[PDB]
């Protein structure tokens, strides 16, 4: 049984335990704080990230990207990332954008649980509260009046997007993105109704 | 004719601009400072980062992974990601691995110029080059005795890990990477003197070839 390294608050794991779920693959699931100068993770992942996936074999994989495009080919479950041609890049180019919004949200959680208060930067605090600003526009100028981020089913882009407005509930509750963005707030409605996700919560 | 925003520093641009010369696609490389109060980047990128690919029609793609991956597919020239299967797998991990080490690499040069000396952190110093360790020795065991990363021939995953090394020179030097590990001393000898490599050098950034 493959073992998927992580933790419930993770939303790149968050991410790849929704793919998981959704493709119907089984998984043993391995908690751990990398934040702890004890951690074991390196062992795993030589960037001391999670989520790692260690197979049967003892191979390790990583980082979410990775472990999510290599999941949806091991199951013929759902199609969560189109074949070829311009869909494919389309929900690449979703993936990046929605972890760009985790990257800068990780940030200002990283900025307050990693640093004491007299090495806090307020430019930096502000970068990266803009940063979300400009890709929950960038999500909802692209997901318009469609239901689904891409051509007409679920994709990672789907799940991708629901993970980083769900971390951002969940980390930034002050951040009123549903106001801002009622398109946004209705496609979390509905994708957050998966057992996938209800499965998932950090 | 697409457009590159990018930085000649940049590795993660780096990275898309030696895809773009070994696929042979024509582009024009637009010069950015992210970090400028009045830069342009996030019209184009909505994260605000380089590098950001620009259409014909206005139309922006990100981050370097996704640009490089759409890349391969325009040209026949090449072909720097495997179509599927294991070695599919395997350089996307390379990928990650060396853009994970580039990660650590920048967090470091931001904690160098966007921290005053009054608020750099040392344990996010020393967290940060655990990383780079680590990273360069997976890189090392992952190449062991072969002439690239996977397969028989230069993949996305060689020009990744070319660009980590390469960075590492550029902005760490006292990082003996060489010293440490032989075999990635002898790979970055044999994949810098690629013409892909050689015209996108980050310290072309110091304007030594407008010089006459």
């Given at each position: 049984?493959?073992?998927?390294?992580?933790?419930?608050?993770?939303?790149?794991?968050?991410?790849?335990?929704?793919v998981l779920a959704e493709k119907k693959i089984?998984?043993?699931?391995?908690?751990?704080?990398?934040?702890?100068?004890?951690?074991?993770?390196?062992?795993?992942?030589?960037?001391?990230?999670?989520?790692?996936?260690?197979?049967?074999?003892?191979?390790?994989?990583?980082?979410?990207?990775?472990?999510?495009?290599?999941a949806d080919?091991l199951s013929?479950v759902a199609?969560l990332?189109?074949?070829?041609?311009?869909?494919?890049?389309?929900?690449?180019?979703?993936?990046?954008?929605?972890?760009?919004?985790?990257?800068?949200?990780?940030?200002?959680?990283?900025?307050?649980?990693?640093?004491?208060?007299?090495?806090?930067?307020?430019?930096?605090?502000?970068?990266?509260?803009?940063?979300?600003?400009?890709?929950?526009?960038?999500?909802?100028?692209?997901?318009?009046?469609?239901?689904?981020?891409?051509?007409?089913?679920?994709?990672?882009?789907?799940?991708?997007?629901?993970?980083?407005?769900?971390?951002?509930?969940?980390?930034?509750?002050?951040?009123?993105?549903?106001?801002?963005?009622?398109?946004?707030?209705?496609?979390?409605?509905?994708?957050?109704?998966?057992?996938?996700?209800?499965?998932?919560?950090?």
């Amino acid at each position: 049984v493959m073992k998927l390294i992580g933790s419930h608050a993770s939303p790149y794991t968050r991410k790849v335990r929704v793919v998981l779920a959704e493709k119907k693959i089984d998984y043993q699931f391995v908690l751990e704080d990398v934040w702890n100068a004890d951690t074991q993770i390196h062992q795993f992942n030589p960037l001391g990230k999670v989520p790692c996936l260690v197979m049967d074999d003892g191979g390790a994989l990583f980082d979410s990207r990775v472990i999510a495009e290599y999941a949806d080919t091991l199951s013929p479950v759902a199609r969560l990332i189109p074949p070829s041609g311009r869909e494919r890049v389309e929900v690449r180019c979703w993936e990046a954008l929605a972890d760009g919004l985790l990257d800068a949200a990780v940030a200002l959680r990283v900025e307050q649980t990693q640093r004491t208060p007299e090495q806090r930067s307020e430019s930096w605090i502000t970068r990266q509260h803009h940063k979300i600003d400009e890709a929950l526009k960038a999500m909802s100028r692209g997901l318009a009046d469609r239901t689904w981020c891409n051509g007409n089913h679920l994709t990672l882009a789907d799940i991708a997007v629901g993970c980083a407005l769900a971390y951002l509930d969940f980390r930034q509750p002050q951040v009123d993105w549903r106001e801002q963005h009622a398109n946004l707030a209705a496609f979390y409605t509905r994708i957050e109704k998966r057992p996938s996700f209800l499965e998932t919560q950090p």
